[PDB]
Design a protein around this motif. Structure first.
Motif, PDB file in Angstrom:
ATOM      1  N   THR A  27      -6.114 -16.103 -27.949  1.00 17.18           N
ATOM      2  CA  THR A  27      -6.994 -15.984 -26.895  1.00 17.18           C
ATOM      3  C   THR A  27      -8.288 -16.264 -27.174  1.00 17.18           C
ATOM      4  O   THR A  27      -8.933 -15.769 -27.929  1.00 17.18           O
ATOM      5  CB  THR A  27      -6.866 -14.469 -26.516  1.00 17.18           C
ATOM      6  N   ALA A  28      -8.855 -17.267 -26.771  1.00 19.47           N
ATOM      7  CA  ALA A  28     -10.135 -17.742 -26.778  1.00 19.47           C
ATOM      8  C   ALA A  28     -11.320 -16.794 -26.370  1.00 19.47           C
ATOM      9  O   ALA A  28     -12.416 -16.867 -26.960  1.00 19.47           O
ATOM     10  CB  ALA A  28     -10.448 -19.149 -25.949  1.00 19.47           C
ATOM     11  N   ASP A  29     -10.962 -15.820 -25.512  1.00 22.71           N
ATOM     12  CA  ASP A  29     -11.806 -14.531 -25.417  1.00 22.71           C
ATOM     13  C   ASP A  29     -12.097 -13.963 -26.998  1.00 22.71           C
ATOM     14  O   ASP A  29     -11.142 -13.650 -27.389  1.00 22.71           O
ATOM     15  CB  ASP A  29     -11.266 -13.543 -24.377  1.00 22.71           C
ATOM     16  N   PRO A  30     -13.553 -13.765 -27.070  1.00 22.66           N
ATOM     17  CA  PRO A  30     -13.907 -13.130 -28.324  1.00 22.66           C
ATOM     18  C   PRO A  30     -13.298 -11.520 -28.321  1.00 22.66           C
ATOM     19  O   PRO A  30     -13.041 -10.837 -29.138  1.00 22.66           O
ATOM     20  CB  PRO A  30     -15.184 -13.181 -28.441  1.00 22.66           C
ATOM     21  N   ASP A  50      -6.016 -16.194 -33.594  1.00 23.88           N
ATOM     22  CA  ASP A  50      -6.567 -15.572 -32.422  1.00 23.88           C
ATOM     23  C   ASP A  50      -6.044 -16.583 -31.362  1.00 23.88           C
ATOM     24  O   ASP A  50      -6.632 -17.476 -30.839  1.00 23.88           O
ATOM     25  CB  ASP A  50      -7.812 -15.573 -32.561  1.00 23.88           C
ATOM     26  N   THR A  75     -10.797  -9.987 -26.804  1.00 21.57           N
ATOM     27  CA  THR A  75      -9.312  -9.678 -27.056  1.00 21.57           C
ATOM     28  C   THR A  75      -8.887 -10.687 -28.367  1.00 21.57           C
ATOM     29  O   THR A  75      -9.151 -11.463 -28.640  1.00 21.57           O
ATOM     30  CB  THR A  75      -8.687  -9.994 -26.064  1.00 21.57           C
ATOM     31  N   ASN A  76      -7.996  -9.725 -28.917  1.00 22.58           N
ATOM     32  CA  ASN A  76      -7.276 -10.319 -30.087  1.00 22.58           C
ATOM     33  C   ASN A  76      -5.791  -9.901 -30.295  1.00 22.58           C
ATOM     34  O   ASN A  76      -5.678  -9.115 -31.181  1.00 22.58           O
ATOM     35  CB  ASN A  76      -8.061 -10.031 -31.194  1.00 22.58           C
TER      36      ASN A  76
END
Ligand SMILES: *[C@@H]1O[C@H](CO)[C@@H](O[C@@H]2O[C@H](CO)[C@@H](O[C@@H]3O[C@H](CO)[C@@H](O)[C@H](O)[C@@H]3O)[C@H](O)[C@H]2NC(C)=O)[C@H](O)[C@H]1NC(C)=O
Ligand SMILES: *[C@@H]1O[C@H](CO)[C@@H](O)[C@H](O)[C@H]1NC(C)=O
Ligand SMILES: *[C@@H]1O[C@H](CO)[C@@H](O)[C@H](O)[C@H]1NC(C)=O
Ligand SMILES: *[C@@H]1O[C@H](CO)[C@@H](O)[C@H](O)[C@H]1NC(C)=O
Ligand SMILES: [Ca+2]
Ligand SMILES: [Ca+2]
Ligand SMILES: [Ca+2]
Ligand SMILES: [Ca+2]
Ligand SMILES: [Ca+2]
Ligand SMILES: [Ca+2]
Ligand SMILES: [Ca+2]
Ligand SMILES: [Ca+2]
Lengths: 275, 486, 25, 123, 48, 39, 271
Positions: free
Chosen positions: A221-224, A219, A226-227
């Motif tokens: 992107t640290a944003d939960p 993952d 988005t993946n």
């Protein structure tokens, strides 16, 4: 001053053609980053020369293929210096190293701009979603303490390090994201581990992370929420390192067709140090 | 570039009065002076989960000097000048503590406190009489009520501690101070004999706010422990900030500047809204006036009026007279209210647009900027007088023209006939001077109405031509903005 | 906008009592 | 209504301008000050903290609604803080089509006449 | 010392001003408005 | 301007307030105020 | 509020009673003596089945026992969408009963008070200080502008003028416009500065005892009998509950939906 404001007009009819030339080196350079486990299992030492010979038939001149051995994922995450042009990083998946692999992928696969952080003298903040902090060294025990508007630590006393919150302990590399817009006081062992305020520019497309083992867990992107699955987040299935290397050599044309040599930097550092 | 940081804390202030005594000679019956004296005090207290160490210093002002003297006899009781505190007297309590807030107390945007009052009561003093009945001082009390916090500093032995000073008012209280066994009863007030009543400390509690201005050259990276103290701060060079202000004109606009220049700017309108510290927001306006008075332009105003008054009882040839009356016209422009666009309008507009986007960093430096711009901005300017549709225009550099209003073609000038009218007829600042006006009429042929308006420097017509995007007026006003270079 | 210079000159008298504050203090 | 909203904003700005500047008309703030002076003089309850915090209120709330005029070449353009807006000839009072763009242009430079006696009353 | 007084406030006194308005004439408020009230003049005549 | 001369302006205003002229001006203004208060 | 234009000739709509009963909830707060005299405990189920006949679905009725009036006064959370408070009256509980009725029937907007530091005024006729806790003993002391207390010494608490003692809930009004210093037992009782907005449509108070004694408005002059201050005589709690059940149409008609954009989250028993 390459005139990055005046528009460029193409045409939608004519013509599919060749790329003319570029003269700064004889040609590109492919660049493998493999763990010591590959060497130990292979039980050889003419194998780098054998792989170069087997790349030659695929169509890479002899001097273009370089090999780099690293201890393991965590020991390599510290200051990963990509000394090269077309980088592949074979990362052996191992349970409990999920977040470490994600850290390394987020570090190399993306182009970072890092400023120093003098922890002893200043508080620190995060400008926005694109700003992380990256801590690297032998041991990074990053204890934070957020402060409200009144400069009183919330959930912590600024003068008592014990009350702090340990976002990440004893990591070779730690990408820490605290809430954006709240001042923090940091505490980490400045003798061993340094830390930097790193903003995220676009992607770095010289590097391909090849997960050698298990499921698709990287993952970036640290944003939960988005993946994404990037074309360079490669994944292969392995039982033997010779099989892995043979697949890489055989399919190397696709491996470099997915990447792009343009996004390269003078220094080999994985981030632009903007002081 | 300078970030506000709130540091509001709840504190407990402990302090004790200081007592000094001086004996008078003889056998030990009299006394010379009983007075309050500055008194230090150390302590520690728990607040917010950490033990903070605090240092306080109490002092007294406004003190009364009562007296009592039993006579010249060598054993009769008395105190030559024994003090007291009552309505007039104030008490200051400088306060310091090791907490992080007091390291960031150099630059402050605002500072005010809320403390709870206290009742101080006098002790019992047995005046050292060698023999006989023992005189007894007792009673007396006041109440400390908080009124206003300021900055201050303890000149402590090891270093000078920047600190907060709490000015408490007073209020005399019930117990009537007396000199019992003696001729003084039913006074009221707290005497200097034993102000503490043997208490270890008098105690106050409250909350004080503070808005510091710790510096910042980058958003993410704010400091702690402000250590750019006035030892670490030094006079920014005169030429250096001159160059900074000149550079600031990179950005000024064309029409918005005229829109600002068409305001009435007063003391409050300009000097308010300056991101300054408390010590400079207190007297910025007076500071500006003090150095405005002595400027070359201001003393020139003074010399003009004084020379005229003295004259009232005393009783390229043309270029010199024109230049002298041009300087005189500049003086008249500054002193009086002209109905035109009035170059000093543009000067003040540039000045405001420059100073608003700066910051006060421990030195005022609006003195040497406001007063300097007032005299240097727009060095060469022009004036005109219309009469019989033959307007005579003059330049401070000495040049002169005389041209018709209906059509802009010049005429031979009339020295001493321009001078008779320049004294009384209203002068018109020539922000659209004759050269640019002739260019405008030649290229963009104009009408009688707008010709007269531009001659008069009418803001309506000037802004109409600016918003037409007229190149001639646009360029002219741009050069006007550009001479403003200190 | 030129009103401020006139205001400074006119109100400049108060600097006398301000320096009086400074020297008496 | 875009015109009404724009004119309301311009009216607020014009009230501020009236306070700032020196107008030769009756200047509503003038009437407010006169009424304040009369009320203060006749009233016999004025403590230390009354004239402060009542002169402010007499600046704020006295005559909340008012109107202004811009005279121009035989015509007049009147605006109101509520949102009303008219334009009429100056010799014979018969309203003519309004031009908000022209009014916004002219209001910044030309002098404003405090419409003490507004067009509703002139007609 | 002294309890000097208590002092009316806006909340207590705005109704008093409301009830005080109706005595105000209009033929001479215009004259008072025309006279320019400076810092001296406005506060000259406060309660004598 | 011999030596640190006092505030000429404020010194003269100290008793230009109490002149016959100033008292008359204040008197007239307060008379109009009372006329406004009582018709 | 934006204007809403409606005619005077549009036909009246249909009865909304079924829709509101299907969509809303009813909740009764009664004293423990009610259950004690009932001497039962299948009675909640019985009354729910009884309400279902009139048309309240099975889960829509919530019975929230409270110990007694004064102990309930502290932090009254009304976990519902239509609230009925049965309220038994005994002499000498007049003021506290009236306080609770005022508190819940009238809407409030409250802010914290910091007794330790600030001197607090009262904004006007709609402003009060409400103190809630296990035992509130407020002691106020008014001040001058020079912070010299009148009828009290600002430093000594004995001189202070007590206005409520040992009360679970106290709604204190004091002279508006005068700074006060307060002393209230900060560990036990919490005091808040509140403004009385319009009425609360959601709550109805069924006094069960004596005379029409409730005075919600602290103003001595107005004592208006608002419709939501219902009253009924009683000897048997079973009779009281049957009365409420049978006339529950009238009670919810007297009440109405709550219209306020709140800012304090809390549990609600909605459907
Ligand atoms: C409002 O008034 C009451 C009336 O007394 C205040 O009670 C006082 O409360 C303080 C602490 O809250 C007590 O202080 C105590 O001091 C002794 C030393 O003498 C110490 O050993 C204790 O640990 C405590 O600190 C004080 O004794 C007590 N008054 C009396 C007469 O006992 C109340 O605190 C006031 N409310 C506020 C918010 O200040
Ligand atoms: C483009 O590259 C191809 C490679 O197959 C080559 O055959 C062709 O000649 C090139 N284009 C031109 C115009 O020569
Ligand atoms: C980090 O914490 C340790 C102990 O928790 C402390 O000794 C050290 O001084 C801290 N680092 C900084 C920069 O204060
Ligand atoms: C309202 O009531 C009338 C009479 O019973 C009925 O005919 C009509 O259908 C009802 N309306 C609705 C929407 O149910
Ligand atoms: Ca890690
Ligand atoms: Ca913690
Ligand atoms: Ca973040
Ligand atoms: Ca993610
Ligand atoms: Ca009392
Ligand atoms: Ca009560
Ligand atoms: Ca009240
Ligand atoms: Ca009532």
């Amino acid at each position: 001053n390459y005139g990055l404001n005046i528009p460029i007009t193409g045409s939608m009819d004519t013509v599919y053609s060749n790329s003319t030339r570029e003269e700064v080196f004889l040609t590109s350079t492919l660049c493998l980053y493999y763990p010591t486990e590959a060497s130990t299992q292979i039980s050889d030492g003419e194998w780098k020369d054998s792989l170069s010979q087997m790349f030659l038939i695929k169509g890479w001149p002899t001097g273009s293929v370089y090999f780099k051995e690293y201890s393991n994922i965590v020991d390599f995450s510290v200051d990963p210096q990509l000394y090269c042009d077309y980088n592949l990083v074979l990362m052996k998946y191992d349970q409990s190293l999920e977040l470490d692999m994600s850290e390394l992928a987020d570090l190399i696969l993306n182009e970072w701009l890092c400023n120093p952080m003098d922890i002893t003298l200043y508080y620190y903040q995060q400008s926005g979603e694109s700003n992380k902090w990256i801590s690297m060294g032998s041991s990074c025990t990053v204890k934070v303490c957020p402060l409200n508007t009144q400069t009183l630590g919330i959930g912590c006393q600024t003068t008592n390090v014990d009350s702090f919150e340990t976002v990440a302990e004893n990591e070779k590399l730690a990408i820490v994201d605290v809430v954006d817009g709240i001042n923090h006081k940091i505490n980490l062992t400045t003798t061993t581990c340094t830390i930097r305020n790193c903003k995220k520019l676009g992607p770095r497309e010289n590097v391909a992370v090849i997960q050698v083992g298990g499921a698709n867990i990287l993952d970036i992107t640290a944003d939960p929420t988005t993946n994404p699955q990037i074309e360079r987040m490669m994944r292969v299935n392995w039982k033997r390192w010779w099989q892995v290397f043979y697949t890489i050599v055989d399919y190397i044309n696709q491996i470099v067709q997915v990447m792009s040599k343009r996004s390269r930097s003078l220094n080999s550092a994985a981030f632009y140090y903007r002081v | 570039l300078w970030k506000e940081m709130q540091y509001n804390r709840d504190i407990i202030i402990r302090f004790k009065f200081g007592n000094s005594i001086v004996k008078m000679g003889g056998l030990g019956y009299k006394w010379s002076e009983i007075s309050y004296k500055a008194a230090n005090y150390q302590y520690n207290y728990l607040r917010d989960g950490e033990q903070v160490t605090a240092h306080t210093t109490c002092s007294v002002n406004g003190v009364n000097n009562f007296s009592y003297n039993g006579g010249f006899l060598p054993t009769d009781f008395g105190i030559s000048r024994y003090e007291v505190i009552k309505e007039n007297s104030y008490v200051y309590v400088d306060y310091w503590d090791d907490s992080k807030a007091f390291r960031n107390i150099v630059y402050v945007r605002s500072l005010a406190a809320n403390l709870n009052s206290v009742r101080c009561t006098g002790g019992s003093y047995h005046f050292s009489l060698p023999v006989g009945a023992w005189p007894v001082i007792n009673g007396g009390a006041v109440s400390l009520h908080f009124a206003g916090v300021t900055l201050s500093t303890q000149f402590t032995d090891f270093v000078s501690l920047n600190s907060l000073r709490f000015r408490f008012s007073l209020t005399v209280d019930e117990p009537p101070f007396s000199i019992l066994r003696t001729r003084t009863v039913n006074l009221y007030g707290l005497p200097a004999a034993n102000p503490n009543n043997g208490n270890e400390y008098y105690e106050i509690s409250g909350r004080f706010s503070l808005i510091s201005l710790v510096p910042t050259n980058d958003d993410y990276q704010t400091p702690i422990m402000n250590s750019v103290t006035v030892r670490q701060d030094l006079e920014r060079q005169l030429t250096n900030l001159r160059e900074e202000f000149n550079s600031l004109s990179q950005e000024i606009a064309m029409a918005q500047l005229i829109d600002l220049a068409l305001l009435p700017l007063d003391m409050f309108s300009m000097f308010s809204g300056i991101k300054s510290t408390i010590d400079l927001t207190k007297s910025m306006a007076t500071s500006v006036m003090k150095k405005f008075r002595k400027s070359k332009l201001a003393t020139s105003i003074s010399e003009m009026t004084n020379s005229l008054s003295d004259a009232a009882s005393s009783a390229n040839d043309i270029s010199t007279q024109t230049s002298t009356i041009g300087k005189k016209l500049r003086l008249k422009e500054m002193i009086t209210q002209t109905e035109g666009m009035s170059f000093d309008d543009i000067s003040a507009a540039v000045l405001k647009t420059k100073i608003d986007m700066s910051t006060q960093i421990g030195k005022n430096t609006l003195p040497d900027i406001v007063t300097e711009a007032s005299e240097k901005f727009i060095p060469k300017r022009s004036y005109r007088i219309l009469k019989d549709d033959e307007v005579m225009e003059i330049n401070t550099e000495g040049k002169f023209f005389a041209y018709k209003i209906n059509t802009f073609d010049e005429v031979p000038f009339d020295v001493n006939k321009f001078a008779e009218l320049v004294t009384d007829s209203p002068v018109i600042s020539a922000i659209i001077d004759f050269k640019t006006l002739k260019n405008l009429n030649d290229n963009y042929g104009i009408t009688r109405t707008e010709a007269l308006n531009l001659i008069k420097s009418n803001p309506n017509m000037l802004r109409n031509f600016i918003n037409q995007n007229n190149p001639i007026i646009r360029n002219r006003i741009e050069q006007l903005i550009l001479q403003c270079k200190l | 906008a030129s009103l401020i210079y006139r205001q400074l000159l006119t109100n400049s008298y108060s600097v006398d009592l301000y320096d009086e504050i400074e020297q008496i203090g």
